């Protein structure tokens, strides 16, 4: 929808800049543009995957970013990395 | 434009800027090394 909701815009930024989210994870070089048509979906695990690949209900969030804030390890890394860049700046 | 924001939206806006500066720093560093080679 034109005048897209802010949470959608801010999630599309996370996929575009996913290379910086985790120090240990690296990606194939890709110039990802926002597609003309797309959908936001929620994954459905199999019942056999109750332990291996299921999130708890409280951890689940409407947006991708709000889950990323919940991760404590991610927040600690971002705080440390952010300070170093500002010190250099 | 000036706006008035709630606490959660400020945290969401604060987080996304932190990510964007880290991406810009990681990209520029990646560029500089490949330029040196």
């Amino acid at each position: 929808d034109d005048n897209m909701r802010r949470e959608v815009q801010r999630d599309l930024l996370l996929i575009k800049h996913r290379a910086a989210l985790d120090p240990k994870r690296h990606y194939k070089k890709q110039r990802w543009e926002v597609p003309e048509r797309f959908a936001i979906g929620t994954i459905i695990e199999d019942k056999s995957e109750f332990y291996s690949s299921r999130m708890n209900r409280k951890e689940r969030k409407s947006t991708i970013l709000e889950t990323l804030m919940g991760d404590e390890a991610s927040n600690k890394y971002f705080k440390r990395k952010y300070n170093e860049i500002q010190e250099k700046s | 434009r000036a706006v008035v924001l709630g606490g959660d939206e400020k945290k969401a806006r604060s987080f996304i800027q932190k990510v964007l500066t880290i991406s810009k720093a990681k990209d520029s560093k990646r560029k500089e090394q490949k330029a040196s080679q």
Partner: peptide
């Protein structure tokens, strides 16, 4: 659009 907007009357 976070860059376009600016926050005022912070609380």
């Amino acid at each position: 659009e976070d860059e376009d907007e600016e926050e005022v009357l912070a609380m």
